[PDB]
Structure formats: structure tokens, C-alpha cells
Amino acid sequence: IVPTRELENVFLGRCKDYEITRYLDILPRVRSDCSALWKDFFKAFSFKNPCDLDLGSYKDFFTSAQQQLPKNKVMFWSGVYDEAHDYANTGRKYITLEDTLPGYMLNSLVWCGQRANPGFNEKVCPDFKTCPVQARESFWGMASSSYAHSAEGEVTYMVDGSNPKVPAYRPDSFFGKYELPNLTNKVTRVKVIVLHRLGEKIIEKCGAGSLLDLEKLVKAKHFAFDCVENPRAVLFLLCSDNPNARECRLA
Amino acid sequence: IVPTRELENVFLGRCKDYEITRYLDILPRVRSDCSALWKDFFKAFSFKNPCDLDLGSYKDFFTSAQQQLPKNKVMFWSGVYDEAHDYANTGRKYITLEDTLPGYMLNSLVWCGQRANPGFNEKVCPDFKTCPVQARESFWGMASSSYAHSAEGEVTYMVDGSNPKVPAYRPDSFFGKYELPNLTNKVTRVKVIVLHRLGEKIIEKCGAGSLLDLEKLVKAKHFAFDCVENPRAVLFLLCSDNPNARECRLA
Numbered sequence: 236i237v238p239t240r241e242l243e244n245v246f247l248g249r250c251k252d253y254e255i256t257r258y259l260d261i262l263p264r265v266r267s268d269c270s271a272l273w274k275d276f277f278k279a280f281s282f283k284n285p286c287d288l289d290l291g292s293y294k295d296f297f298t299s300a301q302q303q304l305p306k307n308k309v310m311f312w313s314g315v316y317d318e319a320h321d322y323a324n325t326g327r328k329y330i331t332l333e334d335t336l337p338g339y340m341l342n343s344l345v346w347c348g349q350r351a352n353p354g355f356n357e358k359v360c361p362d363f364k365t366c367p368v369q370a371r372e373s374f375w376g377m378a379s380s381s382y383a384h385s386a387e388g389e390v391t392y393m394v395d396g397s398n399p400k401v402p403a404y405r406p407d408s409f410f411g412k413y414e415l416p417n418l419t420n421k422v423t424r425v426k427v428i429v430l431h432r433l434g435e436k437i438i439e440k441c442g443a444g445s446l447l448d449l450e451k452l453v454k455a456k457h458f459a460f461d462c463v464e465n466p467r468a469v470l471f472l473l474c475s476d477n478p479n480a481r482e483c484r485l486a
Numbered sequence: 487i488v489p490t491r492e493l494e495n496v497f498l499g500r501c502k503d504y505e506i507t508r509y510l511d512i513l514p515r516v517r518s519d520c521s522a523l524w525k526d527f528f529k530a531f532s533f534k535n536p537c538d539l540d541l542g543s544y545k546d547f548f549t550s551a552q553q554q555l556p557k558n559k560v561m562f563w564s565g566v567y568d569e570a571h572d573y574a575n576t577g578r579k580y581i582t583l584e585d586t587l588p589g590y591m592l593n594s595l596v597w598c599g600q601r602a603n604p605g606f607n608e609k610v611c612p613d614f615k616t617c618p619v620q621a622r623e624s625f626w627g628m629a630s631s632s633y634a635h636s637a638e639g640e641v642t643y644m645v646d647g648s649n650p651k652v653p654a655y656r657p658d659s660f661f662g663k664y665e666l667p668n669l670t671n672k673v674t675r676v677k678v679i680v681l682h683r684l685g686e687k688i689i690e691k692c693g694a695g696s697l698l699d700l701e702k703l704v705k706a707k708h709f710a711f712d713c714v715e716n717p718r719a720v721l722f723l724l725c726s727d728n729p730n731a732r733e734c735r736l737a
């Protein structure tokens with residue numbers, strides 16, 4: 236795995252771009268400036284073995300970078316990156332982690348520590364299947380935890396109901412590990428959107444299988460629950476990429 | 487209008503973000519430094535009255551920032567910003583100006599010259615509706631000229647076929663003034679997509695009115711031509727935002 240070149244300049248430029256021009260009437264600005272956020276992010280991993288991290292490593296960075304999130308708008312997603320982010324629509328309909336400042340800054344980036352100067356590796360990072368899980372998930376797991384902990388009102392969760400190999404809800408996804416269990420009593424309701432991919436066998440349904448497990452967990456955390464499969468607004472987005480599909484037939 | 491804050495920092499950050507991380511497998515990198523782009527850009531408007539620009543002003547910036555564009559994937563749009571960009575899909579289906587380095591760096595920014603130090607106005611810029619035509623259009627007009635100049639193969643032009651106040655095709659739009667005249671013999675075909683917004687009345691149709699004007703122009707420059715109104719992939723995208731529209735009735 237190749238680390239991102241010029242990591243600090245990419246971080247600092249995305250940061251400033253965001254601060255001044257991104258999600259302006261959608262998410263609040265952070266108090267800390269871009270240089271103070273870099274200091275917190277860099278110290279989490281710098282000057283240490285690339286596997287020497289834990290879930291507390293970026294704690295100071297996420298405290299500085301966390302934004303209050305708009306009630307009823309927070310979305311989580313598993314196995315449907317593209318469909319969830321198309322539907323959420325750059326913050327216009329829902330917020331995803333990828334719209335928040337830290338999620339926007341680090342999305343797709345690749346970085347790791349080293350002990351020798353300059354304290355990070357610009358040549359290679361290890362396959363993180365090689366590091367303990369708490370190190371491998373130190374950044375995105377704490378991102379998901381801090382994100383979910385800030386959610387208020389109804390939350391939305393979009394899942395894949397057509398994957399034979401991967402249940403729609405599973406406790407070991409980032410959602411199952413970091414998000415569902417970290418929703419606070421300021422959350423009222425979990426609304427599940429199940430994707431039934433076009434022209435494919437339906438593997439999971441509302442009220443059965445892992446959606447029923449998920450329903451039970453939601454009610455045990457004392458929230459309301461509802462679930463829908465291909466609501467129309469979402470079906471039309473699917474149809475846009477596959478217009479000849481049977482499900483998309485008009486009048 | 488209020489100008490963008492920290493224009494240099496925004497421009498440089500967006501520049502560096504793009505360079506390293508954006509459109510990597512879709513559009514080539516430019517040879518120039520972010521600092522060398524900023525100098526060409528700033529000198530175009532700095533230390534001048536705000537309305538003192540013409541088509542020529544930004545010439546060096548656009549010569550530096552110009553990327554070779556993927557054959558057949560170049561899209562133009564008039565009056566349908568949001569729908570054209572949703573369908574083009576961040577470069578996956580088509581390229582728009584806003585996906586290229588200069589379009590990305592300046593998209594939605596506001597800036598203007600002044601003559602006293604620091605050479606730009608950080609308080610107020612005129613609605614350039616106060617400036618002469620060639621000064622209003624100095625930047626985006628020269629952007630559109632240079633973009634159109636680099637297209638090869640088929641190009642696609644999406645227009646609004648439902649605006650009673652503005653014809654689908656206009657010789658004085660950016661497309662008629664800056665894009666169409668600059669298509670080279672490397673271009674083989676102009677493919678028009680007419681949008682008919684849902685539950686609104688139909689104003690323009692292929693083969694008639696201003697689209698007929700456009701068809702004759704295109705063929706006289708020796709390009710093939712075709713035209714379609716709400717092709718299904720675009721329709722489904724319109725329906726996803728208004729699923730109750732009668733045009734969206736499912737089988």
C-alpha cells in the first residue's frame with residue numbers, strides 16, 4: 236500500500252477548502268484552525284511503529300474536529316457507499332461521515348507512522364490485516380464513534396439486502412462495532428433503508444434475518460424502529476444506472 | 487456581492503487537493519505548480535478596477551491550467567446545472583468544466599480586483615451585472631473557450647427544454663458565444679439532451695425552434711448531430727427528487 240504524497244499539504248488544503256466553502260449552510264464550522272487540527276492529527280500516529288495505535292490515539296483530533304450534527308439528518312450506511320452518498324446528496328438530504336470535516340479531510344487517504352524521522356512513512360504502509368484490530372481501526376473506528384455519539388433525532392441506515400456473502404446488518408461492520416452502540420438517548424428512531432439491487436435475488440427483508448436482529452437491538456436501546464425496501468426515491472436512483480431493468484418499467 | 491475569504495489559501499488548497507487526490511484515473515495532471523497557477527490567475531485581475539477585464543485577461547492562467555480531455559466524454563450544459571452535474575456524476579459518466587482543474591478551483595468563488603493594496607477587494611465586489619459583458623464573462627467565458635477547444639470526439643450538450651423565458655439554445659449564452667465556436671475538427675458529433683422538468687409545460691423540442699437553429703449550425707460546421715428529450719437515465723434521476731410526478735408512474 237502506497238502512502239498519500241504530501242500528506243500535510245493535502246490535509247491542510249482540504250481543511251481550508253472545507254472551512255471556507257464546504258457545507259456552509261449544512262454543518263457548523265469548527266473552532267480550531269487548520270494548523271491546530273494538523274498538530275492533533277499528526278501526533279496521533281507520528282514517531283511510532285505504524286501498528287502502534289489504539290482507539291484513543293486520535294481522541295484529541297476528533298474532539299477538536301467534531302461538529303454538532305443537524306437533527307434527524309444523520310445517515311449511516313453499510314455495503315452501499317455509492318448509493319448511500321448519491322441519495323444523501325452532498326449533505327442536501329442527509330449527512331454522512333464523509334461530509335463532516337474529519338471524514339472529508341481523510342477520505343481515501345493512506346498514511347502511517349514510523350519511529351525514524353520525519354515520523355511518518357512516505358514509501359510504504361503495512362497491510363493493516365497485519366496490525367492489532369485496535370490500531371487498524373484507530374482512526375475510522377473513533378471517527379464513526381464520535382460521529383454516532385453526536386447524532387440527534389431520527390437516524391437513517393442504508394443497507395444491502397442483496398449480498399449472499401454479507402448480511403444486511405452485522406455486529407462486526409463499522410456500524411455494528413462503533414455506530415449503533417454509541418447512539419445516545421438524543422436519538423429517537425432508527426430508520427432502515429434496504430437496498431434490493433436491480434435484477435438480483437433478494438437476500439434480506441424487513442422483519443426477518445439480520446434486520447430482525449437489528450430491530451431487536453434498536454428496541455433494546457429504547458429507540459423507535461422502521462424499515463423500508465427500495466423506497467421510490469431510492470429505486471429511481473438505482474434505475475438511473477440500469478434503465479432497462481424490469482423494476483424500472485414506466486406506466 | 488461579498489467576495490470569498492482567503493482567496494489564495496482556498497485556491498492553493500483546492501489546487502493541491504486536486505493535484506494529489508482528485509480525478510486521478512479520469513483527467514491528467516497539469517505540469518504547472520499550484521504557485522505558478524496562482525500567479526497567472528492573480529495577475530489577471532489584481533491592482534485594476536473590478537470591471538477592468540476582457541476575454542483576454544486570464545489567458546495565461548487557462549493556457550497553464552488546461553488539461554487534455556477524454557475523447558467523447560466532454561459535456562456542456564446551459565440552464566440545467568444541477569441535473570447535468572448529477573448525470574455526469576463527478577466525471578464517471580461525463581466530464582464537465584467544474585471537474586477540470588480550473589473549474590474545480592474557482593467553482594462558486596467570488597473575487598474582484600481593486601487598484602490600492604492588496605490589489606483585490608475583500609469587502610465587496612460588484613454584481614458584475616454592473617460590468618460590461620466582456621468583463622462579466624472574462625473568467626468563465628475564457629474557461630469555457632479553452633475547455634471547448636480541447637474536446638475531441640463526441641460532445642454532449644444538456645439544455646433546459648421547459649424555460650418559457652430562456653430558449654434551449656441561444657447565440658449569446660456561454661455555450662453559443664464561447665463553446666460552440668471553439669469546437670475543433672477533432673469533434674465529430676454534438677449530442678443534445680433536452681430536459682423537460684417534471685409537471686412543467688414543454689417549451690422546446692428536438693427539430694423545432696432554437697434546437698432547429700442549433701442543429702443547422704452544428705451541421706454547417708460539419709458535425710453529426712442528434713437530440714433526445716428526457717432519455718430514461720435522466721428521467722429516473724428527475725423522478726428520484728419528485729417521485730409523485732405523473733411522468734414517474736411505475737408499470
Ligand SMILES: Nc1nc(=O)c2ncn([C@@H]3O[C@H](COP(=O)(O)OP(=O)(O)OC[C@H]4OC[C@H](O)[C@@H]4O)[C@@H](O)[C@H]3O)c2[nH]1
Nearest residue numbers: 311312313314315332333342343344375376379408409410
Ligand atoms: N469513508 C471511509 N474512507 C476511508 O478511506 C476508509 N478506510 C476505512 N474505512 C472504514 O470502512 C467502512 C466501510 O465498510 P462496509 O462493510 O461497507 O460498512 P461498515 O463496515 O458499516 O462502514 C460504513 C460506516 O462507517 C462510515 C459511515 O459512518 C458508515 O455507517 C467505513 O465506514 C469506515 O469506517 C473508510 N471509510
Ligand SMILES: Nc1nc(=O)c2ncn([C@@H]3O[C@H](COP(=O)(O)OP(=O)(O)OC[C@H]4OC[C@H](O)[C@@H]4O)[C@@H](O)[C@H]3O)c2[nH]1
Nearest residue numbers: 562563564565566583584589593594595626630659660661
Ligand atoms: N460559479 C460559476 N461556476 C461555473 O462553473 C460556471 N459555469 C458557467 N457559469 C456561468 O453561469 C451562467 C449560467 O448560464 P446558463 O444560461 O446556465 O448557461 P451558459 O450561459 O451556456 O453557460 C454554461 C456553459 O459554460 C460553462 C459550462 O461549460 C457550460 O457548458 C453563465 O453566464 C456562465 O457564465 C459559471 N459560474
